[PDB]
Amino acid sequence: MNITVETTVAAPVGKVWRAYTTPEDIKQWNAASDDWHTTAATVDLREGGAFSSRMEAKDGSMGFDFAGTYTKVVENKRIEYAFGDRTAKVEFLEAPQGVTVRVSFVAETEYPVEQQQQGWQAILNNFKRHVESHLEHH
């Protein structure tokens, strides 16, 4: 199954796209802890480029290992990449009222379809909150 999620934000396409693939920006809404756990996020912004972001737990709070590599990028607007044994493609749409960000990915059988849908949507929602924190828009 293919799972699709979408989030619309009131921000310039260039700023959203650049923030979408900045690791320091990613840390703003993910990959951080108060109880002193080791997190790091990296993004390699180039077609064919490869990157990995990881979270670690000192006490056992949270953590994970995510890796991905880019296969195609178009007009800073259409991007396809692979992550582990699954793949995803993100599209950026310019709207009169705002910019819409759409992410489609292949379902992982180990996790419920609904849980994955909400998870990836939450990521875009975190991107929305990132915009809101970095732009009056709220």
How many Å apart are CA 26 and CA 20, to the nearest integer? Answer: 8
Distance CA 101, CA 18 (A): 13
CA dihedral sign of residues 16, 17, 20, 24: negative
Structure-solving method? NMR
Please answer whether residues 106 and 87 qualify as being in contact, where contact means their C-beta atoms are separated by less than 8 angstroms.
yes
Look up residue 40 and give its amino acid: A
The DSSP annotation for 34-77 comes to: SS---EE-----STT-EEEEEE--SSSS--EEEEEEEEEEETTT
Which letter, b or e, does each residue of 16-29 get, where b requires 16 or more Cβ atoms within 10 Å of its Cβ? Answer: bbebbbeeebbebb
Question: CATH no. for residue 42?
Answer: 3.30.530.20
HSE-CB for 17 with a 13 A CA cutoff: 17
C-beta of residue 51 within 8 angstroms of C-beta of residue 45: no
| Closest by CA position to 45, among listed 14, 16, 88, 79 | 79
Residues 6+ apart with CB under 8 A from 60: none
Distance CA 129, CA 63 (A): 22
Q: Which domain holds residue 92?
A: 1-138
Q: How many residues does this entry show for the chain?
A: 138
Tokens representing 74 are 């178009």
Q: What is the dihedral of CA 130, 133, 134, 136, to 10 degrees?
A: 130
Report the domain count for the chain. 1
User: Which string of b and e fits 80-104 if b means at least 16 CB within 10 Å?
Assistant: bbbbeeeebbbebeeeeebbbbebb
Identify residue 78 by its one-letter amino acid code.
R
User: Which residues are paired to 82 by β-bridges?
Assistant: 69, 87
